Design a protein around this ligand. Structure first.
Ligand SMILES: [Mg+2]
Ligand SMILES: [Mg+2]
Ligand SMILES: [Mg+2]
Ligand SMILES: [Mg+2]
Ligand SMILES: [Mg+2]
Ligand SMILES: [Mg+2]
Ligand SMILES: [Mg+2]
Ligand SMILES: [Mg+2]
Ligand SMILES: [Mg+2]
Ligand SMILES: [Mg+2]
Ligand SMILES: [Mg+2]
Ligand SMILES: [Mg+2]
Ligand SMILES: [Mg+2]
Ligand SMILES: [Mg+2]
Ligand SMILES: [Mg+2]
Ligand SMILES: [Mg+2]
Ligand SMILES: [Mg+2]
Ligand SMILES: [Mg+2]
Ligand SMILES: [Mg+2]
Ligand SMILES: [Mg+2]
Ligand SMILES: [Mg+2]
Ligand SMILES: [Mg+2]
Ligand SMILES: [Mg+2]
Ligand SMILES: [Mg+2]
Ligand SMILES: [Mg+2]
Ligand SMILES: [Mg+2]
Ligand SMILES: [Mg+2]
Ligand SMILES: [Mg+2]
Ligand SMILES: [Mg+2]
Ligand SMILES: [Mg+2]
Ligand SMILES: [Mg+2]
Ligand SMILES: [Mg+2]
Ligand SMILES: [Mg+2]
Ligand SMILES: [Mg+2]
Ligand SMILES: [Mg+2]
Ligand SMILES: [Mg+2]
Ligand SMILES: [Mg+2]
Ligand SMILES: [Mg+2]
Ligand SMILES: [Mg+2]
Ligand SMILES: [Mg+2]
Ligand SMILES: [Mg+2]
Ligand SMILES: [Mg+2]
Ligand SMILES: [Mg+2]
Ligand SMILES: [Mg+2]
Ligand SMILES: [Mg+2]
Ligand SMILES: [Mg+2]
Ligand SMILES: [Mg+2]
Ligand SMILES: [Mg+2]
Ligand SMILES: [Mg+2]
Ligand SMILES: [Mg+2]
Ligand SMILES: [Mg+2]
Ligand SMILES: [Mg+2]
Ligand SMILES: [Mg+2]
Ligand SMILES: [Mg+2]
Ligand SMILES: [Mg+2]
Ligand SMILES: [Mg+2]
Ligand SMILES: [Mg+2]
Ligand SMILES: [Mg+2]
Ligand SMILES: [Mg+2]
Ligand SMILES: [Mg+2]
Lengths: 46, 110, 118, 117, 56
RNA sequence: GGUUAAGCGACUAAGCGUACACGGUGGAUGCCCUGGCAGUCAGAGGCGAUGAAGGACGUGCUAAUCUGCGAUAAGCGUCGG
RNA sequence: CCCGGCGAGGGGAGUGAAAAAGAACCUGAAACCGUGUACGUACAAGCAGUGGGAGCACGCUUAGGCGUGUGACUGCGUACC
RNA sequence: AGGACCGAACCGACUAAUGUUGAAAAAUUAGCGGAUGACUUGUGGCUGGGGGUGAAAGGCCAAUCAAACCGGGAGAUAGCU
RNA sequence: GUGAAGAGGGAAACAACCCAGACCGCCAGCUAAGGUCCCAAAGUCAUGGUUAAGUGGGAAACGAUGUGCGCGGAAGAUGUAACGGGGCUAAACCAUGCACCGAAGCUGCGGCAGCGACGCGCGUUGUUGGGUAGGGGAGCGUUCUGUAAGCCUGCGAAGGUGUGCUGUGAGGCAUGCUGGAGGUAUCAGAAGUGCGAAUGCUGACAUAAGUAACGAUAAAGCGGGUGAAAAGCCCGCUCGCCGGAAGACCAAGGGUUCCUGUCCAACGUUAAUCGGGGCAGGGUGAGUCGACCCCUAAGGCGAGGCCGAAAGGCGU
């Protein structure tokens, strides 16, 4: 069975990456929330 | 003079080792080594090493001679269990307990 | 029910059994003593000793039977040139099965089977 | 002022489990089962403190009946005669005498028979 | 189908009453080497019935 | 005396139960506090294009991670303690 | 030092006030699992107790019964929420 | 020539059996349908929740769908258990 | 009226029927309902009648030379099974009588408590004490604060675990062992104050059970090596399987799994000397391969711009 997660680094970075998050204010708020929570990994980037 | 050997965290369930332990309880140690030699169990190898260690402890630390020694007390206690996850069908996970045991042999001459 | 039936299945199908006993007969002929499980040794008697009896009479046809069996010219040559004459007078019982305890890996009853004149 | 329940809970559980000594299986090991066992045991003990008197009176009457019929009178007539003779020995003592003094019980039987005659 | 009641340690012991291993009745002693061995089995030093049957 | 007959009859524990002794497992309990929680009195109420918050990578006699630091890299100068 | 696989684990020795404080480490409860001992248990039917109760074992200190453990047999008795 | 025929790759999923605490949260085995097309497939892109998409089944939209998931209102409300 | 919210005795068993309302203790007595052959306590009781059907111990309409209450009618499916059983010719039925048994009822003895009356908290006395929802009263215990820079405590605290004593209870005290540094009277004060249930939550540990299973029925055998140990590791010889793949090379994806040495706790559904496991070391070399780069597609972003409460949407 084809499972739901079919990895693609390009698609991953484009849809969830740092620059994608910074592109919109809602993404920027995601980043602000993750910084407030103290996440070691802000995005899928690293 | 009682002399003890323990094998703590023996990797075998206490129920499997107690079968072998029952064979030699109260036996003369030469007879016990004979019995363990021809018992076709893993627990036989484990218990035999414990018994030989006990006999050697008696001879060396306590000065006793092997001909007088009997397996005065033998018991197997449960040691800590290692907990493992063995997947089953349909995404259900089952826990595997990998049980260990503490083998204690007490040899004495009287 | 298996009344009066003979031959051990040994948890193998027929082709595997036949191939395994061909191999094992070859090993027994070339080494003259092999260590195998007791049931396999007991069934191996019934495969090897007929080979030796066949080897008692040296002919082209007999050598071709001993080659159709065992499929090995090393083994056929040893049979007809050594074991045949070595056992020329002995009427059967060319092998000897010596029980030798238990296999460590799986507690199988092990046995040495050897040619009697080794 | 947080209160940890450990010591007090251990004390109550230990108390019940001590009362449950001798019971089979979980009934002496397991507090849920032991507590039920101890309560039922107390219930039984209360009921039996009553039943003990009935059982012993029944036993005394049986022994008195046996001894009286050995002396030729049934318990009914024997007790009736002792009432008639104004003899107030009770069944416990009467049964003790029946077992241990056949002569004294024979005297009592004769006294009762005289009263009934 | 599955139990309704936890079987007791008593019943577990009763079931296991037949699980005890039987020790080897007694060993044989080779007439030549003097080593003990299972009867009808070669000794650890390769003896059987007083014969060195396997070298080494 | 012995035999026979009749009657009655303990001694067994494969295991199991109860009690006790000694253990194992487990990590409760008690005790503990470099952690928190709530405040009081003060302080400061911002940081950032002189590049922030937050990171990446690096940096040691250093293999790792943490702390510090930034190719001048567990630190450089100067003034004072 | 010794057994052990140049193991694991253990027994000694030593340290220590204490290793039954040995790092799987303060105290170490209970479930659960054992070993030893006493008693019972293989003609016996059911909430497994309770009332009666023999026998046995054990500890006793007017030498007497007492205490403790067990519980043959027997009356009654269908858990808790 | 052909939404032509038979038939592998490939796409599907009609039947039966097995499996159904599976080898597998949908498979395996034996058969079956399409197999130059309204085909199939890689990579990338777009459509976002009362919204999308739908050769239309209330189908599908991350094993979730007669209204996704996550956080919040929120300790909703519960004459009920 | 009882149960609900009520135990006890009887009706075999049997909430609601009968008797009777449990304050506690007693190895005393008398009774109720109901009983008195044995199970099973008490009459194989007495007197006088009836029944022959096991009626008693299931039932009609109707029918019968039964007899001084009895018969047929009267068939069910696991087992007698429509007396509780054994059994009973009374141990059935009726009447009379006297006995006895029979309850946690009554009485006796000892104890506790509530309420009230009389007299000075005490006494005397009467009486009461089943209990759910619920109301009232009185306490126990836990943590913390004051008392308390007190008191106890290394001559052993808390905790744990036994034992004994003690109270109506919650409980309390003492003490052995363990433990090794805390505890805390008293009277007050405050509560995260008491658990067996919530298909409660978390951890631990059981059960089924040493059971099912060990994951493709392509398949192994033997010799040698190494090793503590080899079915599985290495070598060899056979053997079998794939071969439009189960071979080879990449992309994506992964990220050191690669190679060597070493180790075998854990991991590997077994063993393991072996390993994609632990540990250490090594290994990836580009002008030409690829990316980057140049160029664009779908699409994205988008100076200005247009639009929009704001956010923002579209777009040159
Ligand atoms: Mg899965
Ligand atoms: Mg035959
Ligand atoms: Mg097999
Ligand atoms: Mg074939
Ligand atoms: Mg506190
Ligand atoms: Mg206990
Ligand atoms: Mg059920
Ligand atoms: Mg079994
Ligand atoms: Mg026992
Ligand atoms: Mg060591
Ligand atoms: Mg300390
Ligand atoms: Mg400890
Ligand atoms: Mg314990
Ligand atoms: Mg009989
Ligand atoms: Mg008996
Ligand atoms: Mg039974
Ligand atoms: Mg009964
Ligand atoms: Mg076509
Ligand atoms: Mg489809
Ligand atoms: Mg079938
Ligand atoms: Mg198919
Ligand atoms: Mg077609
Ligand atoms: Mg076709
Ligand atoms: Mg529809
Ligand atoms: Mg879905
Ligand atoms: Mg909605
Ligand atoms: Mg609201
Ligand atoms: Mg709620
Ligand atoms: Mg109600
Ligand atoms: Mg009643
Ligand atoms: Mg009754
Ligand atoms: Mg009353
Ligand atoms: Mg009677
Ligand atoms: Mg009848
Ligand atoms: Mg009639
Ligand atoms: Mg008929
Ligand atoms: Mg019948
Ligand atoms: Mg009376
Ligand atoms: Mg009474
Ligand atoms: Mg009364
Ligand atoms: Mg009351
Ligand atoms: Mg305290
Ligand atoms: Mg205080
Ligand atoms: Mg609370
Ligand atoms: Mg409750
Ligand atoms: Mg089974
Ligand atoms: Mg089976
Ligand atoms: Mg099986
Ligand atoms: Mg396999
Ligand atoms: Mg080999
Ligand atoms: Mg293999
Ligand atoms: Mg090979
Ligand atoms: Mg690695
Ligand atoms: Mg490799
Ligand atoms: Mg392994
Ligand atoms: Mg090993
Ligand atoms: Mg590796
Ligand atoms: Mg464009
Ligand atoms: Mg735009
Ligand atoms: Mg603009």
């Amino acid at each position: 069975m084809k499972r739901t997660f079919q990895p693609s680094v390009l698609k991953r970075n484009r849809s969830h990456g740092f620059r994608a998050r910074m592109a919109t204010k809602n993404g920027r708020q995601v980043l602000a929330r993750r910084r407030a929570k103290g996440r070691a990994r802000l995005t899928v980037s690293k | 003079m009682e002399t003890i050997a323990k094998h703590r965290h023996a990797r075998s369930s206490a129920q499997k080792v107690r079968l072998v332990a029952d064979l030699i309880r109260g036996k003369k140690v030469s007879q016990a080594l004979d019995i363990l030699t021809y018992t076709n169990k893993k627990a036989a190898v484990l218990v035999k090493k414990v018994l030989e260690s006990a006999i050697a402890n008696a001879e060396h630390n306590d000065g006793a001679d092997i001909d007088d020694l009997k397996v005065t007390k033998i018991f197997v206690d449960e040691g800590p269990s290692m907990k493992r996850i063995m997947p089953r069908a349909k995404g259900r996970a089952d826990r595997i307990l990998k049980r260990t045991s503490h083998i204690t042999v007490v040899v004495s001459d009287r | 029910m298996r009344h009066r039936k003979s031959g051990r299945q040994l948890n193998r199908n027929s082709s595997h059994r036949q191939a395994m006993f061909r191999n094992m007969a070859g090993s027994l002929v070339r080494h003259e003593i092999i260590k195998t499980t007791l049931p396999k040794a007991k069934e191996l008697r019934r495969v090897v000793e007929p080979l030796i009896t066949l080897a008692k009479t040296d002919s082209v046809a007999n050598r071709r039977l001993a080659f159709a069996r065992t499929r090995d010219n090393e083994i056929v040559a040893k049979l007809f040139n050594e074991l045949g004459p070595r056992f020329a007078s002995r009427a059967g019982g060319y092998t000897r099965i010596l029980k030798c305890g238990f296999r460590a890996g799986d507690n199988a009853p092990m046995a040495y089977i050897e040619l009697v004149d080794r | 002022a947080r209160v940890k329940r450990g010591v007090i809970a251990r004390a109550r559980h230990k108390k019940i489990l001590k009362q449950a000594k001798g019971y089979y299986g979980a009934r002496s090991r397991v507090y849920r089962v032991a507590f039920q066992a101890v309560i039922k045991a107390g219930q039984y003990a209360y009921r039996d403190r009553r039943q003990r008197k009935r059982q012993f009176r029944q036993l005394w009457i049986a022994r008195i009946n046996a001894a009286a019929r050995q002396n030729g009178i049934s318990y009914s007539k024997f007790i009736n005669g002792l009432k008639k003779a104004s003899v107030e020995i009770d069944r416990k003592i009467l049964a003790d005498i029946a077992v241990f003094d056949k002569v004294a019980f024979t005297a009592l039987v004769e006294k009762a028979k005289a009263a009934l005659a | 189908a599955v139990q309704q009641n936890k079987p007791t340690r008593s019943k577990r012991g009763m079931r296991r009453s037949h699980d005890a291993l039987t020790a080897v009745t007694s060993l044989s002693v080779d007439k030549t080497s003097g080593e003990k061995h299972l009867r009808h089995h070669i000794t650890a030093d390769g003896y059987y019935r007083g014969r060195k049957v396997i070298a080494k």
